Design a protein around this ligand. Structure first.
Ligand code: CL
Ligand code: CL
Ligand code: CL
Ligand code: CL
Lengths: 375, 375, 375, 375
């Protein structure tokens, strides 16, 4: 019921608080309860999050026996030391082992739905990656970006309810609750109910107005897509772009991006700053990079700050406090890097510029690119 | 300003009412005014809507001289009789002809933005397909699906304002106004502000709740994607699916789709009906097809009616009036086939079941799959 | 022993004369002897010659139960009404059926060697397509181009020995015997011992010298590859090209080919003649085509005649007798269309121009493009 | 005239001896004579041997201004620091610069013939890579594998004539002369007249007979293709395979290759030896590798030695002298690594086993895989 995600949010948080296996399929729970780390597991797919389970820090909590891939099972190649088998071989092994769980590593509809139905048809206990992380107690032993943020959410319920009340539009509220429900339940369909295309990130959110004289701080410029998006929505008309990116390979790419615009009338308005955005000026290991505050990097009052960085977005925002507090530029702040960012970043921005309106959109079919908008 | 699309809607409708060239770039208008049907045009792209301009009924209203395609300009192949040239050859011709307009046939960001910027850089008058249709007065001489619905919208302003007031949620209202603004202005960025992914059509709209015992009428079943989507969101659990599709090639495909589910426990709950959905029972040219009303095709009360058909959706709904009026199933009704469908279909449904709530989402980056939801 | 293919030729011809199952694997012969047309067969591959067995005229001589394709077995699609299964499913069926033969339809090393080894590993009786045609007595019920020419060769042994003696070089003799051995034995490795690349057909045979003033009759011009090859080996320098092609779709393609050379200094030297080459002038069903003799089509003495046509190459050569007899142009005559062509075409040409030297090369990894050279 | 390559060989060697620019197009020679290292050059293609000219040791002998690639000229990417331009931009620059030479880096028919004709049509002086190496005096400053071996051949004429006389068959003689003519003239069409497919290397040469009990030394086993080829031509029947390969990444791949045969009845007959083949036992930088003689690595008399290694093939053969001299196995020795290998390797083998017959085939459309056969 996507029209009552506030209700499901509270119910999920209460359920998880008293049951750490909340959200784990019953048939898998009973195997794990029966066999513990002798549980036999088969990875479905060789192009998904299965690498995150195999690279896991410390001894695995189950015996991984194979990976299924119908397009590779005759190659003789191993998948993280595992044999690669056909789907037919997997259903055969499953019919004869009780006791054998399948990890569906696929994230996209075609492959995911295929393997999920194969499992259902044969009554094979199965899990997606977030469910695997929770069911096998791998919190802290996987990359933080694919970790279980359930418990963190359960500790901050009132603060999330307070954020919900502060959001300017109903769709942002639905989006907030959908993201928190995904983390509480491990159910990706929550994102799917609210998601917007990747192509609409920052520039087509339904919340911001761009003029023909924008001055954009492109913080975490990567490969230049946000510059391409500003160009597109403004029809090649802006005042200034300051692109900030510390990675040396990305900076090589941006030199290629700058060359595609060399004959435009706006080429001279774009600069690239090979540093990271932070709260002060310091040279640190990234390989050393320079880190500088936004307020020192730029030389004019911005109208828009886009932010998607590997480092602390809270430190980066503090390094832009004069720009934010004095000029109230529109902001598009990526909000999916830490379980705490939706609250922490919002709380920081409002403490320095309390008259902002706030929105939230989710822009991929996966857990990436939940983005806060301030205008 | 996507937060004031109601305002832009009224302003655009007033502007168009008194200027048929409303929405056409000034530099193109001045060429067309100066040269009329001696206007020289270059088609940019060979994989877009350019086929719709070349297949146009009756003499063209401009002299089309070439098509640009950097991946094909050495092949010796013609594009609808036109030479295929490089982008460099095009900019050269443009620098020497006043007077020469470019039709950007590309609909997707990469190719579209590329050609739009090429044109801007060199000051070359350019148009997208909807702008071309309006600027050259091709209304009625192109396929109705790619025609200019501007004037139709201008004739029905109060009825659209009345629809806006009837929609249950703000995002549906924003979506309504965004779609109408696209048609009034020929500006696709209006869709982009509100669009959701194609993958979320019907089953992930943010508005409907599906149970584990759904009985779905899949009207216009095509290649079986809606069956795959119901299976996915319900995790292989439903009571019944009646798939209705009249096209013989699609029916061959559905036999393949049915075979992928032969060993599932729900295979017996799905039937295929090789007919079209209409208001009564009649055999008509499509090649003859049988047309039957939904109320006669099905044998139980449905919980959900998905509808996307080539024929009249109003006739199809009248053929389901007993199901709709007596049982109030959820409905997902594709609303983009006629300029009048948003009003006509809604008005019909409410006259037979007035207690429905109504929503609207747009599910592609193009003009396809604007869908009404009733629940 | 490729250094004694003359010996193997005679031995194979004697073996076949007294055993129609010569060349058929013993384990398959014993199944066919035991079960006849109740023999169960599995087609390996869905992209090979398997369509030739399924389209076979009259009732099949075995019960075809499935086709193996690991990249398609979950699609629900049928292969000529057959279920598509995985290789693992096939080895399972084979382990339990005696009695079950596999037809390896693959012609190229990767896929062919894969399936051949799968069969050997599991002791599964298997056949290639030529072996299938012979083992099931399908001579005359398959396309003539993929038929068993064994018996025809056995009837003409001395004439083939006489051809061998007439060939000017040892490699042509080895090639002759390799082609005849393929047909006598159904063993494609015979072609492999002598084959040259497709890219060397006509222009890079190792036998012909082309000058800078060639006048080429391109008989069966198709899609213009021979024109491209003459251009390449002569570095854009020739006197004349007469391209002869009757198929209307090929003639559309040749207009595209002619456009790629429009600015060259040799464009005016090329003409296209939309007719078939034959012995006289007649309009016949191909859809009607004009058929004309080469001697009437051309307007000058040629230096080279390339020939690869669907119709009778003997009739086509008779329609060029004045050119051949009077001017002794170099000839490249495709020799793989009929079991009789190596003898019939050579005998004809020498009767009108007896001073020619003769060579033979085979230019694909399959049975296509065995070509006679006369110079 | 491929029927007189012995004659062309001697004429080319005499021409080169007295003219180092022999084989260079006259129009390019006159530019180079006029401008020397101020010659402006355009590289055609970004996927060929152009990297060999750009990575050249020491200052370039011309000013390289751009690279042409119609599929990349809008990317903003540079090709070894060079701008990437369209073919139309190149013809424009060429029409206005005298003085501007084009290097056609393409080696395959489609792309090579395209650029060669573009150049001819516009009268643009052009060269292939071997011609570039010779015309700009880059001998010794490019990778030895793509260097000009002309002068080396001119110093060894009688020894090559002596090799020609020792070859057992006419096609080997034609092949020898074709390879030497390529190096003397820089004209790749010489290879094309004699080349056989890559798929026929070692196992389908037209010269060797393989039994069902072969014992193969696979020297330079790489990625396991020769094992796959022996398996194919013998239909999975051999006695032993000793695979010798020193590269650690190749050895990882061979473990994958061994797994594809784990259930065959010949898996136990194959061993992998992670060392290089040389004349004695020594540990040397390749990263250190073990180098051992073949006679010590193997434990039985071989029937076949295939050899294609990065190191000295003469040292490797000396490390197999007992096997070669005592048992006369068939040999397939790659002969294209050094300008001297055809003479040096043959001379060595015959000094230890003088009763061998010798053949030679060339197995790619490029300069790779000229192979000597001894049987
Ligand atoms: Cl299950
Ligand atoms: Cl413009
Ligand atoms: Cl077998
Ligand atoms: Cl030239």
């Amino acid at each position: 019921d996507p029209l009552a995600m506030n209700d499901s949010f509270l119910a999920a948080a209460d359920a998880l608080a008293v049951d750490p296996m909340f959200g784990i399929p019953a048939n898998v729970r009973e195997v794990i309860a029966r066999r513990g780390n002798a549980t036999r597991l088969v990875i479905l797919g060789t192009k998904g999050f299965g690498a995150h389970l195999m690279n896991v820090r410390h001894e695995r909590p189950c015996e991984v026996i194979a990976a299924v891939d119908d397009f590779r099972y005759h190659s003789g190649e191993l998948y993280y030391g595992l044999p690669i088998i056909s789907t037919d071989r997997f259903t055969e092994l499953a019919t004869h082992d009780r006791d054998l769980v399948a990890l569906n590593t696929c994230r996209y509809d075609g492959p995911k739905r295929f393997f999920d139905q194969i499992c259902r048809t044969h009554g094979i206990p199965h899990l997606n990656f977030e469910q695997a992380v929770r069911a096998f107690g791998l919190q802290g032993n996987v990359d933080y970006r694919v970790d279980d943020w359930g418990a963190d959410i359960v500790r901050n319920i009132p603060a999330f309810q307070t954020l919900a009340q502060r959001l300017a539009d109903d769709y942002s509220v639905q989006t907030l609750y959908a993201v928190l429900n995904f983390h509480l339940t491990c159910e990706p369909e929550y994102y799917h109910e609210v998601e917007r295309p990747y192509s609409t990130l920052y520039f087509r959110s339904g919340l911001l107005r761009f003029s023909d004289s924008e001055k954009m701080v492109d913080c975490g410029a990567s490969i230049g897509e946000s510059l391409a998006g500003l160009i597109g929505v403004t029809k090649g008309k802006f005042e200034r772009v300051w692109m900030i990116e510390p990675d040396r390979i990305n900076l090589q790419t941006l030199q290629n991006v700058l060359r595609r615009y060399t004959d435009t009338n706006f080429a001279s308005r774009i600069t690239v700053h090979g540093c990271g955005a932070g709260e002060n000026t310091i040279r640190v290991p990234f390989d050393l990079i320079d880190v500088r505050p936004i307020d020192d990097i730029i030389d004019d009052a911005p109208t828009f700050i886009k932010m998607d960085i590997e480092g602390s977005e809270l430190s980066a925002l503090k390094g832009a406090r004069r720009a934010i507090s004095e000029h109230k530029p529109k902001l598009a702040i990526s909000a999916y890097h830490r379980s705490t960012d939706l609250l922490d970043l919002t709380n920081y921005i409002l403490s320095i510029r309390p008259d902002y309106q706030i929105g939230l959109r989710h822009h991929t079919p996966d857990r990436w690119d939940t983005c806060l908008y301030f205008y």
